Amino acid sequence: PTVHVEVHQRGSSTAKKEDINLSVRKLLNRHNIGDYTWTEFDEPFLTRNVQSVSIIDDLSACTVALHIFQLNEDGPIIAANHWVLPAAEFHGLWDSLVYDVEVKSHLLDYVMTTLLFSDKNVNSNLITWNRVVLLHGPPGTGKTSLCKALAQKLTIRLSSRYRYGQLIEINSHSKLVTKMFQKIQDLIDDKDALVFVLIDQVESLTAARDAIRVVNAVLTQIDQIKRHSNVVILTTSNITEKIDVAFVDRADIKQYIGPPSAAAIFKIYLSCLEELMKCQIIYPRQQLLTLRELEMIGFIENNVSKLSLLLNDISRKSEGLSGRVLRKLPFLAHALYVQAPTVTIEGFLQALSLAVDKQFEERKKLAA
Numbered sequence: 001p002t003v004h005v006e007v008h009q010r011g012s013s014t015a016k017k018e019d020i021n022l023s024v025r026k027l028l029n030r031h032n033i034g035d036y037t038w039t040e041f042d043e044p045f046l047t048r049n050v051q052s053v054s055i056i057d058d059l060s061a062c063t064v065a066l067h068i069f070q071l072n073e074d075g076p077i078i079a080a081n082h083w084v085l086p087a088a089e090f091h092g093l094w095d096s097l098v099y100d101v102e103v104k105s106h107l108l109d110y111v112m113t114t115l116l117f118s119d120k121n122v123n124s125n126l127i128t129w130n131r132v133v134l135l136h137g138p139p140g141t142g143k144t145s146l147c148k149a150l151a152q153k154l155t156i157r158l159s160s161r162y163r164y165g166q167l168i169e170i171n172s173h174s175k176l177v178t179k180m181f182q183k184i185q186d187l188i189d190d191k192d193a194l195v196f197v198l199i200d201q202v203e204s205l206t207a208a209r210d211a212i213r214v215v216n217a218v219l220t221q222i223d224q225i226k227r228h229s230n231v232v233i234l235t236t237s238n239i240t241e242k243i244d245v246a247f248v249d250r251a252d253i254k255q256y257i258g259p260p261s262a263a264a265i266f267k268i269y270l271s272c273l274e275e276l277m278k279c280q281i282i283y284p285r286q287q288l289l290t291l292r293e294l295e296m297i298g299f300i301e302n303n304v305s306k307l308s309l310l311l312n313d314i315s316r317k318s319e320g321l322s323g324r325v326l327r328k329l330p331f332l333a334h335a336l337y338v339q340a341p342t343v344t345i346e347g348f349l350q351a352l353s354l355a356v357d358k359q360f361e362e363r364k365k366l367a368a
């Protein structure tokens with residue numbers, strides 16, 4: 001039963017990966033026992049070369065797969081943003097996206113099997129696969145982030161097959177096309193690279209419809225690059241119910257992404273409050289309980305539970321908000337209702353509650 005361990009090698013490190021592979025395995029044998037991350041090590045070679053060793057889904061002998069990676073520090077071809085993968089900009093993006101249904105797992109597995117099928121030359125006339133992915137759902141769901149985070153994950157997890165990755169994010173809002181796709185082809189010519197091309201909000205092309213010619217040229221250019229073994233095409237759409245030309249039939253991986261449920265919201269807020277405690281904007285630090293812990297005490301209210309119960313109740317009246325709004329509310333909370341360097345978590349929860357109420361007042365104003 002395989003167990004994945006992501007090893008973040010320092011940018012300033014010049015050690016061979018084989019040496020890091022040997023150290024990290026020796027460390028894992030020391031401890032020998034859920035998801036856990038190391039940021040400090042007794043051993044100096046690890047201190048010197050590794051920023052984190054993180055175990056991702058209590059046991060010892062499993063088949064253990066390490067993925068050692070080194071963030072490419074400098075970020076960005078216009079109209080296109082370009083990142084070498086793994087990119088320092090996308091570090092932690094994956095974990096920042098909380099979904100209900102374990103969408104991220106399936107999404108990774110689908111594209112994994114797609115790349116495996118590409119790589120072994122499975123006749124697509126006999127088993128259905130292709131290099132196009134469509135994330136659709138309402139705005140603010142994390143679709144674009146999830147594409148970038150998926151590209152990063154795939155690159156980190158397929159280091160054995162590809163030495164590095166590439167992400168080109170075409171901005172829907174925009175001859176010159178042929179120059180930008182010349183650039184992308186030159187990246188693809190390096191078969192050590194796994195190249196991702198991301199077309200944000202594809203519905204914008206059929207909505208923005210000279211504009212006829214610009215669209216048909218991008219289609220023919222996409223059709224040209226999806227012919228290559230090391231290409232994945234990522235697309236998103238904010239109109240989920242509407243069929244679309246022509247990425248709908250274009251995509252053997254379609255995936256709905258919807259707004260967070262009250263459970264997901266709770267985990268989302270927890271990740272925000274943890275960060276504020278880490279940075280000590282919330283002080284002093286208090287323990288917060290998970291929903292599972294609350295459920296184990298029957299949601300009795302006491303000193304351990306009171307504030308976590310209050311957060312749970314804030315999560316419930318946040319239902320309806322998108323994740324974009326949700327990760328923005330702690331900033332609004334702090335800016336509108338604290339406006340001081342430091343606040344107890346009692347005071348912040350109460351600030352966040354007001355902010356939430358303020359969102360729906362604005363919503364109701366947009367209605368009338």
Ligand SMILES: Nc1ncnc2c1ncn2[C@@H]1O[C@H](COP(=O)(O)OP(=O)(O)OP(=O)(O)O)[C@@H](O)[C@H]1O
Pocket residue numbers: 096097098099138139140141142143144145146200201236237238260268322323324325327
């Ligand atoms: N499920 C979620 N959990 C945590 N944060 C989220 C979630 N969904 C959205 N967000 C926050 O909102 C930010 C922006 O979302 P993003 O713009 O990727 O969503 P989108 O509107 O679906 O994408 P686009 O409109 O560009 O196609 C994310 O980086 C994330 O911080």
